[PDB]
Symmetry: D3
Subunit: 117 residues, 6 copies
Amino acid sequence: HCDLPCGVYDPAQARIEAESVKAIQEKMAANDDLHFQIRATVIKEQRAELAKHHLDVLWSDYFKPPHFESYPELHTLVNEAVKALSAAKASTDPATGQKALDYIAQIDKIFWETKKA
Amino acid sequence: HCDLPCGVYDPAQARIEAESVKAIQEKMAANDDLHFQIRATVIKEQRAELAKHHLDVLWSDYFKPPHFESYPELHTLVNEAVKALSAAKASTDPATGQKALDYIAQIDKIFWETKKA
Amino acid sequence: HCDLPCGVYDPAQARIEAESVKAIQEKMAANDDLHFQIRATVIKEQRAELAKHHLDVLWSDYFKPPHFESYPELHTLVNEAVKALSAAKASTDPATGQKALDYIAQIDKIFWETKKA
Amino acid sequence: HCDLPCGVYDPAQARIEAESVKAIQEKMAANDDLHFQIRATVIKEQRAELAKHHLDVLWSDYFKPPHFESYPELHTLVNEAVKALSAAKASTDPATGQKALDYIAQIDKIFWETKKA
Amino acid sequence: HCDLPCGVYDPAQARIEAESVKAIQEKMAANDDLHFQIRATVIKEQRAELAKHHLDVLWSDYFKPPHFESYPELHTLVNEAVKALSAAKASTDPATGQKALDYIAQIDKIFWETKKA
Amino acid sequence: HCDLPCGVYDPAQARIEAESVKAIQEKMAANDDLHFQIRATVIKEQRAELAKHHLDVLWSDYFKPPHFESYPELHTLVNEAVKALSAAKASTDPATGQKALDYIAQIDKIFWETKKA
Ligand code: NI
Ligand code: NI
Ligand code: NI
Ligand code: NI
Ligand code: NI
Ligand code: NI
């Protein structure tokens, strides 16, 4: 995932950051303090950005034509996933964070299926 | 391009970094000193990574579903472009840097067509 | 602009980031929502910082003694430009973003004159 | 792990980067090409640094005073793990990467033990 | 402090950033303007993170096994210091910034004792 | 130095990184191992870049118009200092690192005079 290439990839990197995004949104719903809201927004922005980066890496570096051919909806899936994370940045609703996680879960399954080949 | 969204995008960001990549490759052909080769490799890696990032942003943030439908080759084009940049990271041949620039030019053409549409 | 040196420079890098800064300020005037204001402030800060970095690079790496000798006001111009970007970070008034853009335009003019030279 | 706090942590972040470090050392033994060796060294350094960061975060943010009292050897364990990663940066021997992975496996076990308790 | 190793370290790096943290908390008490509060929070978060990084580096890279043996409370001390910085991130009270500074002073004392010994 | 502004600045930040640069150059003369040379080059590049950044910050953020009016030489001094760091990036000769340190010492002297004025 470092572009050497190293041969090491794991959608878990994207998932873990995305889990932080939703976790932060849930915390924002339990505390309306101004400074907490500012910090939560700043940090959620950072973790969502990292999640997008990890997904972009899988898309650009790991997945190759045969994968996009075998899984015709993969390009759309990853693009919807990163767009879902962008939506999560602009929202405090945990549902947006979950939407991203729903897509990431699918990418993870596809990833491991391709690993068996 | 900052994901606010700010409404400001320009493939020139990717292009300028890609131009440095090719420029560095050309310099590597005119100086075989070990330390220069090391520094050139290190810096080319950084510039290529930035170019990939800029392209990833156009793909994830700027282009929307309507664009991918209007341009069936768009997902593939950006994917091949970032892969071309990965190839340039692993090579000292300016031809690889040029291949990346050629893909970026194709993306640039589509970008501006969607801006006028 | 990577300090190899690669020989590739373009004020466009600083300009695009400064354009985002002003664009964000424009958007902040049309949406008083707390969370949007927070995100806009965070992102404007990041873009302005990148703009300052790009100008610092032109000043430290591209411009050479012969240039400062031929344009006695250059040191001051770049310094005023980066200070204008700092002022934009601390303001939501698009006029501050525009002031930075005006200085960048002055630097861009000098840059290209030294390039044709 | 973002220091909000978000309540989301996983030693997997450190493990994945450490796996890349070892994977790179193994690849370095199969290709003695100068430029590949330069890129591998550069990338291994970056991945090891990220691994150290992730472990530092577990130590500084996740683990609390009670944990250090329950596991008196924990401070030393994490400290030896990060030092092992520093050793891996300075080595092409996959055994150094494995040594870091072994320490991380021990930290992982303690981590999950505390997550249940 | 760069992990080469270069042999150059100084708790001053952590201290300067921690001083900025407290300085910012002091400024936050003299200006309740929303946008200033947002920027101050954003920046305080960044400087505190740098401070934690510098302390993490002293702990992982500079201090060696013999040092932890000679100073049984050192692991705990550095951990309390980084946790104090985390507390400062989540607070506008200058007292939190000062608490971090007090811990850093204790680390600085031990640092120089090990340097002269 | 964070651009809030926080009111906290110290040329020591630039100095310590520049000291690492020279220290690394010293070590490069004592070990000709290829991999060590690669790592030393990579890390020296990073430390020199940080030093340039700290100096750019003093120039763009700390020094104000009155300061430059009192010490016009400041523009040239800082510009020469950052150029000296660029030269140090491209060299293994400790003398280049020392040249940068000498300029930094001159800047440091002026800095403290302005602090006491
Ligand atoms: Ni990799
Ligand atoms: Ni943007
Ligand atoms: Ni360059
Ligand atoms: Ni977190
Ligand atoms: Ni060091
Ligand atoms: Ni500051």
